[PDB]
From a paper:
In M. tuberculosis, the cell wall contains high levels of 3 → 3 (meso-Dap–meso-Dap) cross-links (approx. 80% at stationary phase), which are formed by the l,d-transpeptidases (Ldts) (ESI†).6 Evidence has emerged that LdtMt2, in particular, plays an important role in the virulence of M. tuberculosis, as disruption of the ldtMt2 gene results in altered morphology and inhibition of colony growth. Mechanistically, the Ldts differ from the PBPs through their use of a nucleophilic cysteine rather than serine during catalysis. Several β-lactam antibiotics, in particular carbapenems, have been shown to inhibit the activity of LdtMt2 and to have anti-TB activity. Such LdtMt2 inhibition involves covalent modification of the nucleophilic cysteine (Cys354), which reacts with β-lactam antibiotics to give (a) stable acyl–enzyme complex(es).
Structural studies on LdtMt2 with potent inhibitor ebselen reveal opening of the benzisoselenazolone ring by a nucleophilic cysteine, forming a complex involving extensive hydrophobic interactions with a substrate-binding loop. LdtMt2 crystals were soaked with ebselen, and the structure of the complex was solved by molecular replacement (ESI†). In both protein chains in the ASU, electron density consistent with the presence of a single ebselen-derived adduct was observed extending from Cys354. While a single ebselen conformation was refined in chain B (conformation II), two different conformations were refined in chain A (conformations I and II). Apparent pi-stacking between the phenol ring of Tyr318 and the ebselen-derived phenyl ring proximal to Cys354 (ring A in Fig. 2A) is present in conformations I and II; this interaction has also been observed in the complex derived from LdtMt2 and 5,5′-dithiobis-(2-nitrobenzoic acid). The position of the ebselen-derived phenyl ring distal to Cys354 (ring B) depends on the conformation of ebselen; in conformation I, ring B appears to pi-stack with His352, while in conformation II, it interacts primarily with Val333.
Author numbering: 57 to 407
């Protein structure tokens, strides 16, 4: 007769076993009659046996720097076979935790990139990218690009089509992200693209025009950066929205006590760059809005229009600035992703 054969997904005596996959045992020419797995302290590991008795797998994630011992017995008409296997899992030098935006279940605008931010510098960007699975429906091509040593972004060539579902699975637990840095955990988030909302601030008219699904719905007189502190041209992604916010220049790098510093409370403020540009209520400049530029870079509008903007724009909507005397918003600003040409974005910078 034929003696049962056992096949494990680990080898006895292995070291550095990664914990990004379950551990399995398979029987052939027989069935699994006993399968147990314990850690170094004797703590059992939860598992599940298939109804046909041929396949057993762990059902909870295994830990770092552990020693596991697997005992399996297979029985068949032709005899019995028993094996004992002991293996050692990865021993990270450090862990890093990923943080994903936008939030799970959110509806966002057509400019919203997927963002994965780690709390440590990532030595092996390629490994991180390979560990992140992005599903889109309808499917569209996209690509990864790193804004700095810790945050990676994914987006398509053109703005998203409304109604697209986007699923983000960051499967970094057990993955070596370089230099002994392993993922602290997995994260899973899902979001959806809503209406197309694109607002254009044209320096030639000093008007901020809001288009919803292609139709002009609001035309807002604005005052942008004066010549000495101009507003940069380019594509801005709407970020966070505030009924009011204490605008403190030191958050954007400039001491309040410096000549260009400031600390003032502002109403109805919508963030459009990490450098600190907002659409906001500006009662002090209503006389100049629609005529001349008087601000330090923000888009000043009236209180009523700033509240309208707050109420009708969402994270990931788009503000485009054109014809100013400024330069172009940096692509790595944090909300300036779309100013990177697609060929450069697509090629990436994983190194
Ligand atoms: Se931008 C902005 C938006 C609302 C209120 C104030 C500002 C601002 O930057 N003010 C400022 C900049 C530099 C020096 C003084 C004041
Ligand atoms: N983001
Ligand atoms: N992907």
């Amino acid at each position: 007769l034929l003696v049962p054969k056992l096949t494990a997904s680990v080898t006895d005596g292995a070291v550095g076993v990664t914990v990004d996959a379950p551990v399995s045992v398979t029987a052939a020419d027989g069935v699994l009659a006993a399968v147990t797995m314990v850690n170094d302290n004797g703590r059992p590991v939860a598992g599940r046996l298939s109804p046909d008795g041929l396949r057993w797998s762990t059902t909870e994630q295994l830990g770092y720097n552990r020693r596991y011992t697997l005992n399996a017995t297979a029985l068949g008409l032709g005899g019995a076979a028993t094996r004992q296997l002991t293996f050692q899992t990865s021993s990270p030098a450090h862990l890093t935790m990923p943080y994903v935006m936008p939030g799970d279940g959110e509806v966002v605008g057509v400019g919203e990139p997927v963002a994965i931010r780690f709390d440590e510098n990532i030595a092996d960007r390629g490994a991180a990218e390979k560990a992140i699975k992005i599903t889109t429906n309808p499917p569209v091509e996209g690509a990864f690009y790193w804004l700095n040593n810790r945050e990676v972004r994914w987006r398509p060539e053109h703005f998203w089509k409304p109604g697209t579902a986007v699923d983000v699975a960051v499967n970094t637990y057990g993955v070596d992200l370089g230099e002994g840095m392993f993922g602290e955990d997995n994260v899973q988030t899902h979001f959806t693209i809503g209406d197309e909302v694109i607002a254009t601030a044209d320096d030639n008219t000093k008007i901020l025009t809001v288009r919803v699904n292609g139709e002009v719905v609001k035309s807002m007189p604005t005052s942008m950066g004066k010549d000495s502190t101009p507003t940069a041209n380019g594509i801005y992604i709407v970020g966070s929205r505030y009924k009011h916010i204490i605008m403190d220049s030191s958050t954007y790098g400039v001491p309040v006590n410096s000549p260009n510093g400031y600390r003032t409370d502002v109403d109805w403020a919508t963030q459009i760059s990490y450098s600190g540009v907002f659409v906001h209520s500006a009662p002090w400049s209503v006389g100049a809005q629609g005529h001349t530029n008087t601000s330090h870079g923000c888009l000043n509008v009236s209180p009523s229009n700033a509240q309208w903007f707050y109420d009708h724009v969402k994270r990931g909507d788009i503000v485009e600035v054109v014809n100013t005397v400024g330069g172009t918003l940096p692509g790595i600003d944090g909300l300036g992703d779309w100013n990177i040409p697609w060929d450069q974005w697509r090629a990436g910078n994983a190194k």
